[PDB]
Amino acid sequence: ATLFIADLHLQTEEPAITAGFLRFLQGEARQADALYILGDLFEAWIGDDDPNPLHQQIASAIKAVVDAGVPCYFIHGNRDFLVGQRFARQSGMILLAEEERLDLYGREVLIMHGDTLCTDDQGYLAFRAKVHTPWIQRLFLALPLFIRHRIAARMRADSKAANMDVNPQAVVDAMERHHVQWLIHGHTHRPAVHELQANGQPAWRVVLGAWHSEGSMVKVTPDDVELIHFPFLEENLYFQSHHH
Numbered sequence: 001a002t003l004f005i006a007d008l009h010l011q012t013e014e015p016a017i018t019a020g021f022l023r024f025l026q027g028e029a030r031q032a033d034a035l036y037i038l039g040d041l042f043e044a045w046i047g048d049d050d051p052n053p054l055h056q057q058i059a060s061a062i063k064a065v066v067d068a069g070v071p072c073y074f075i076h077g078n079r080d081f082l083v084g085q086r087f088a089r090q091s092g093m094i095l096l097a098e099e100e101r102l103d104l105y106g107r108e109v110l111i112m113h114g115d116t117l118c119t120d121d122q123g124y125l126a127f128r129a130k131v132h133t134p135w136i137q138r139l140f141l142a143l144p145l146f147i148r149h150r151i152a153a154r155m156r157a158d159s160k161a162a163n164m165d166v167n168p169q170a171v172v173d174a175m176e177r178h179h180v181q182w183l184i185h186g187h188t189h190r191p192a193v194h195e196l197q198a199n200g201q202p203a204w205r206v207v208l209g210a211w212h213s214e215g216s217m218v219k220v221t222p223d224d225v226e227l228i229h230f231p232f233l234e235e236n237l238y239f240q241s242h243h244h
């Protein structure tokens, strides 16, 4: 069974999500053939030299899964597109490109974060092209940490004040470029299974959920595809004395 997660948005202000991810890693992920994280693991990222302790805690927990024999892969999200090869080494995770095609027990599956499918949000596309320009990233990463913190906090406030689903033709385009009948992504926070047609045959798009009140994962076995929602922490059972 292969596991897919996305859109956790880990941040120190939300310790329950972090505790839920740690429990996931020490329970579900240890039994997997592989773990794919399709972007937005963290709520923000300004470079791998950030001494934010949460980054180290998360890196050590993933590395433990990797050391238990479960390979771990990461595709960048729109929030954490600056995760680099230093963090990859500390966590044992492999960085993948923005589009990848996998063989999952015989079925060809395309995986991506999903933000590049949102071709109607032309404000987002302009922002994305900017911060994904290599010379603009290198210039930003070369600034002092305290400068990068101030820039990022200001850009986050500017986006909340300036406040989309995928384009259907963009879905078909990618699934036909890669000649696949299965696509897995996140980003939209709308967990669903969508049926469509691609390459003259039935096709499916599986969307992950964000970790808001509960966790979410897609599990792919040789027999089925599973969208699974679960609580973060171990919810102990206790009884209330209801009356007939």
Ligand SMILES: CC(=O)N1CCc2cc(S(=O)(=O)N3CCN(c4cc(C(F)(F)F)ccn4)CC3)ccc21
Pocket: 043, 044, 045, 046, 078, 079, 080, 082, 124, 127, 130, 131, 132, 136, 137, 140, 151, 152, 153, 155, 156, 159
């Ligand atoms: C829509 C969206 O995706 N948004 C909205 C707002 C925001 C904030 C962060 S961030 O806080 O994590 N952060 C901000 C600063 N980033 C930069 C900045 C520059 C430069 F200053 F040169 F333009 C270059 C390269 N990267 C890294 C990421 C992530 C994502 C999104």
Ligand SMILES: [Mn+2]
Pocket: 007, 008, 009, 040, 187, 188, 189, 210
């Ligand atoms: Mn997200």
Ligand SMILES: [Mn+2]
Pocket: 007, 039, 040, 077, 078, 079, 113, 115, 186, 187, 188
């Ligand atoms: Mn996203």
